[PDB]
Amino acid sequence: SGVNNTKKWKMEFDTRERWENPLMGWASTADPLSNLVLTFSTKEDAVAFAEKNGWSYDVEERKVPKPKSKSYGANFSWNKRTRVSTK
């Protein structure tokens, strides 16, 4: 339930091939950017960084949870379906 890892913007790159090492079965890669993850304060900072580096990019809008209407008293409604059958 913690939300502290949803505060900042991230930039990552498209995933590329990983294959099994013939000797040990380890995951090999030829992609030098496979682990690069950048952190940004705002979407505009992330876009600015990508542009000046010449990277094509996609932006995904932030998904804030919408405010909910919570009422403990609703658990015990006289004539509504929100009445709980158990606690």
């Binding site: 409604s77 006289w78 004539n79 509504k80 379906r81 929100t82 009445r83 059958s85």
Partner: protein, 44 residues
């Protein structure tokens, strides 16, 4: 006739398994009609 020396709650010596529910069944005719929530249950 003021006898303050005997126990006058002896009726319950003759109560049985269904005494309470028989009285509730007997009382059924004296009740007012119940209120309604508007539906058969919270799951309706």
């Amino acid at each position: 006739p003021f006898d303050n020396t005997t126990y006058k709650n002896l009726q319950h010596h003759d109560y049985s398994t269904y005494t309470f529910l028989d009285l509730n069944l007997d009382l059924s005719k004296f009740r007012m009609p119940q209120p309604s929530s508007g539906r058969e249950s919270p799951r309706h």
